A paper describes a structure:
Despite the biological significance of these two glycosyltransferases involved in pathogenicity and avoidance of the host innate immune response, their structures and the molecular basis of their activity have not been investigated. This study reports the crystal structures of [name] and [name] from [name] as well as multiple structures of [name] in complex with its substrates (for example UDP, N-acetylglucosamine or SDR peptides), products (glycosylated SDR peptides) or phosphate ions. Altogether, the extensive snapshots of [name] complexes in multiple states provided a mechanistic insight into how [name] recognizes and glycosylates the clustered serine residues in the SDR proteins.
Two glycosyltransferases (GTases), [name] and [name], are responsible for the glycosylation of [name] SDR proteins such as ClfA and ClfB. [name] first appends N-acetyl­glucosamine (GlcNAc) moieties onto serine residues (O-glycosylation) within the SDR domain using uridine diphos­phate N-acetylglucosamine (UDP-GlcNAc) as a donor substrate. The subsequent addition of GlcNAc to the glycoproteins is catalyzed by the second enzyme, [name], yielding glycosylated SDR proteins in which each SD repeat is decorated with GlcNAc disaccharide moieties. The glycosylation of SDR proteins mediated by [name] and [name] protects SDR proteins from degradation by host proteases, thereby circumventing innate immune attack.
Author numbering:
A (entry chain A): 1 to 496
B (entry chain B): 1 to 309, 312 to 496
The structure:
């Protein structure tokens, strides 16, 4: 059995999350057992996983100990008619919210919070004593059951939390003490195997959990090396783990030798004999990493993404309009303001031009402030993150990358697969490998926005080029075919 | 020859403008000659019309007297260099514009303005005197020639206008005086037929033109009645004309008998004996009109739009996409849809509203999308011409106006498989939707009932598909083949 350890799955999948799911779906078709391992406590991971993996494709560490691994949504529960009818409480609704303030004949007891406006998903319930101190907080799983009560001290500070199984029995206790104005774990009690276990640390908890999962002949893959690498350090070398690096390994990629390893990858690079091999996406990163490592341990390049059969429309280009697209999380590294800029000085040459920006991150409001400032309301669109962008690649003329650091770009390959050429700064890793300028898009010089504007403008001018590039896009998309990676993954696993 | 008579075509086609082109394409297929007439001076008309009808398909009255009827673009002319290389002027380019100031050795002469940044289309040239007053503006046709010079007075006020043919010769003159604070024609001179004609307003010119155009057994349709009815009224009964009505005919739809006509239509109704008939779109409007006019003249219903044979109903599971194909004008009540989405976003976090159109409320509507934080959900997509791919992942169409004839936007939805949820307004929705067949009719302005239904259909994808299948069915009742029959019928019998 092959385990791909990560942290968790977001509402919106991140690059690492998407990459993990891809490995899982390749291993599915290949015929090898595989499973995702998630470490982070997350009561919404069932909902978050549902449109991508099945509850048997994944083990979550907390679920495991909560005897709630492979548990489904149970039947919905009318909490409000419980409180009114059964409990003879009265329910003052809080305005502009799915919240409530529960009372028993003018005694304030708890503050209820739901996720949804149908009031079917209870999120949390907060408990108050005689003097309206917030004493205890009950958090609920998205499948129904009460998952964790938390006990508060002083200024709603976390003193400890208790994790339960869906039947209610306690399975986990965590004790907090406040260092630097923030709760740090200091004790963990785990009820497991009809015994009691003690750990000082969530890492020590992580290691224990692995040792349970592990059988002889099982193989691990460490994908959030921030957390997963410390966990594996406290694991016997007898247990094979292969590191998977999900981005550029160093703080400045221009200083190949005189540059520190990233805070996230430091723990792996310190214990490099722990890991059976290390996997990057780009050949360049394979070369770069094994020189800096000094070939102490093998390195392989297996790309995080692959190209699949296209049974939606490709290059159905309305000859009157020009859709440009960004498919990138709205974070600073992606440098999306440069694209709003580009669209600014480009409407006058191509009016009726559109830029659709697919993502959602933190820069949402900063990005929206510019499309508004420059008058670009009817030309630039902040389309929220959505999967199955296949319909959304159909009318796309070009893809833009203006990030500065990317590693393998899943959205880059996804463009090429839909026949949409991409114009991207010439950065590491990824674009260099996936784009050949004047083959399937163009590589632009870093942050050289005038060079950017020129080629984007040139390509909008001569559609004969877009069609030529769009062709070779499909060509390049094929070198990363699902078969190329099933085999490439099968060969890697056998060698190990 | 059948002549459909409107004002002109805009950069974004209006409902009537779309209708005149639809009628043309219909006649063109069925083989009866027809061609659009446009009245107002519009020096971008040939560019506006490039995608919809030929230059053989249309006669603009200014083009006609300007002897530029059926004229096409010239070879490019390099004005920038001509002013430099041949007129030894300097060009002080104006910042953030396609404009130059034109000097002759520190003497400020002209302010040029180009449309495009490629400087290939000269738009207008402003002329200044020795004191730097703007005395003359030179308006250029997008085909390259000088169409009109306007002489200014006082506070850049329009005093008279001269209209040329492409050779340069002068063909019309208009003299203005200011009523309120706007210019108003008071004299028109026309050099046509090697003679001089005098008219007192643009209406009398319009009537003079018609008679120039008219030949025995030509037939005319009046499609912009605020302007065209006054024209045909100054025209002899011997010229056949048929009124065509494009909105509700009455200031208030609720008093069928009592209320006044819309200002647009007063001129028409007050002289109903001049028109061989009225065309309307919906069977209902045919009746309501007939009652009021006491069957004085024939009323006939011939829908403004037809359906025809591109991906359809390729619905992504995770996202719900709502569409409004409607102008950003106030009587479409498009703010109500932003309010809808605002309520509906916490039940449907993946929802979108794409709002296709142009219009005066682009700013009111933009502010609300900003105020409510719906910038990631409601989009002002602005006017798009071919919408065939936007309809593909459309879940439903939305209508929230209060006044409509046939909705061409509604039928287009139904044609592309997209059910419509509309208020129960006259005319059009009553006729094209059958609730729980291809969409729902809502009590007018019942924004709760609207929300209730929109959320419902979203809740039941299986209903949506049932509704989509009925929308395709109803659309084939308004087919192309059938409307060519309706036109050929109701031309032959007039």
């Amino acid at each position: 059995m092959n385990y791909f350890v990560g942290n968790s799955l977001g509402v919106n999948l991140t690059g690492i999350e998407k990459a993990i799911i891809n490995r899982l779906n390749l291993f599915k078709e290949m015929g090898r057992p595989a499973q995702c391992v998630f470490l982070s406590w997350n009561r919404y991971l069932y909902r978050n996983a549902q449109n991508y993996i099945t509850s048997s494709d994944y083990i979550n560490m907390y679920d495991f100990f909560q005897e709630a691994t492979y548990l489904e949504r149970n039947e919905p529960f009318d909490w409000l008619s419980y409180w009114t009818d059964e409990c003879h409480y009265t329910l003052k609704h809080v305005e502009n919210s799915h919240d409530f303030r529960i009372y028993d004949q003018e005694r304030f007891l708890m503050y209820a919070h739901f996720q949804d406006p149908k009031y079917r998903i209870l999120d949390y319930v907060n408990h108050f004593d005689s003097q309206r101190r917030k004493v205890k907080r009950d958090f609920y799983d998205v499948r129904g059951f009460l998952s964790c009560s938390r006990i508060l001290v002083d200024k709603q500070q976390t003193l400890c939390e208790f994790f339960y199984n869906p039947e209610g029995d306690t399975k986990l206790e965590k004790y907090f003490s406040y260092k630097d104005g923030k709760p740090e774990v200091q004790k963990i009690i785990v009820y497991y195997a009809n015994k009691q276990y003690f750990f000082n640390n969530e890492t020590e908890l992580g290691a224990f959990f692995i040792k349970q999962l592990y059988q002889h002949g099982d193989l691990f893959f460490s994908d959030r090396n921030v957390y997963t690498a410390p966990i594996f350090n406290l694991t016997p070398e007898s247990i094979p783990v292969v590191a998977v690096l999900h981005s550029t390994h160093i703080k400045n990629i221009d200083a190949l030798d005189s540059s520190p390893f990233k805070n996230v990858y430091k723990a792996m690079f310190e214990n490099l004999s722990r890991y059976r091999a290390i996997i990057v996406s780009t050949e360049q990163q394979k070369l770069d990493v094994e020189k800096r490592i000094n070939h102490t341990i093998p390195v392989v390049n297996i790309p995080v993404g692959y190209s699949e059969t296209i049974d939606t429309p490709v290059q159905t280009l309305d000859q009157r309009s020009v859709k440009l697209i960004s498919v990138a999380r709205y974070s600073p590294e992606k440098q999306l303001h440069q694209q709003i800029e580009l669209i600014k000085r480009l409407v006058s040459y191509v009016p009726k031009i559109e830029l659709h920006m697919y993502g959602f991150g933190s820069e949402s409001k900063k990005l929206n402030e510019l499309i508004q400032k420059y008058g670009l309301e009817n030309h630039v669109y902040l389309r929220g993150f959505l999967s199955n962008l296949d319909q959304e690649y159909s009318d796309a003329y070009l893809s833009l990358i203006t990030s500065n650091m990317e590693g393998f770009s899943l959205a880059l390959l996804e463009s090429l697969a839909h026949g949409v050429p991409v114009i991207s700064y010439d950065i590491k890793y990824g674009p260099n490998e996936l784009i050949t300028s004047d083959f399937n898009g163009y590589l632009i010089t870093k942050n050289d926005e005038d060079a950017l504007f020129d080629k984007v403008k040139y390509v909008i001018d001569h559609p004969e080029v877009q069609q030529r590039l769009s062709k070779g896009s499909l060509a390049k998309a094929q070198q990363y075919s699902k078969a190329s990676l099933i085999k490439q993954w099968d060969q890697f696993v056998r060698l190990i």
